[PDB]
């Protein structure tokens, strides 16, 4: 009944030293029934990464919408959109549906190509921006993620240390949520290289 917990899933993002990480589980379900273990919730437009939890039809729709909009942006601006700018675009787009909203929990992650500064941001379904220095969480196990991140996180982690921290935050949070899991992906993002890692986890 609750649109934000029909399909399930989680996204988490973290900042480190000259790097950002964004991760998600791979489950799509119809309440109790597991439907897909390959439903990735992280997308990217140039060097800007966007995770989206919530109602899966809206996850797909918003990805297609932001691909649409960032493609036109690039053609007109003659440059790739930056994380700070894209964050405002996500906020604007969500708030235009104020009284008929998309039931989602978006998360932005990236590095500004000119300043080199790591950037993360989170939103409620209606566009309110949470711009945390440390970490952003979203989805049906957001409580569990907040608990994991708050204790595991420390600032200025090196890329390969940040990978371990964010992976362990996701995995253990998902294992305490019925509607999350069935695989996981972690993106480690540096100024001009991005590594994508699929994690091994329990399949129940």
């Amino acid at each position: 009944s609750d649109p934000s917990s029909i399909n399930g899933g989680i996204v988490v993002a973290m900042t480190g030293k000259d790097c950002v990480a964004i991760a998600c589980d791979l489950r799509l379900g119809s309440q109790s029934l597991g439907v897909s273990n390959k439903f990735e919730k992280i997308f990217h437009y140039g060097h800007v990464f966007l995770g989206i939890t919530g109602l899966a039809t809206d996850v797909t729709t918003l990805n297609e919408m932001f691909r649409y909009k960032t493609n036109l942006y690039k053609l007109k601006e003659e440059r790739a959109i930056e994380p700070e700018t894209f964050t405002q675009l996500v906020s604007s787009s969500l708030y235009e549906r104020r009284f008929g909203p998309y039931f989602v929990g978006p998360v932005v992650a990236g590095i500004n190509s000119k300043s080199g500064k790591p950037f993360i941001a989170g939103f409620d379904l209606i566009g309110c921006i949470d711009e945390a220095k440390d970490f952003i969480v979203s989805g049906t196990a957001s409580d569990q993620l907040f608990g994991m991140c708050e204790s595991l996180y420390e600032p200025n982690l090196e890329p390969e240390d940040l990978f371990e921290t964010i992976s362990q935050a996701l995995l253990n949070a998902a294992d305490r949520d019925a509607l999350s899991g069935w695989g996981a992906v972690v993106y480690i993002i540096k100024k001009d290289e991005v590594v994508k890692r699929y994690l091994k986890m329990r399949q129940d």
Partner: peptide, 17 residues
């Protein structure tokens, strides 16, 4: 709802259960 997935096998309703 417009929820699409590519699958090796699939169903709708209670059939999958």
């Amino acid at each position: 709802l417009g929820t699409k997935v590519e699958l090796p096998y699939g169903a709708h309703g209670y059939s999958g259960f």
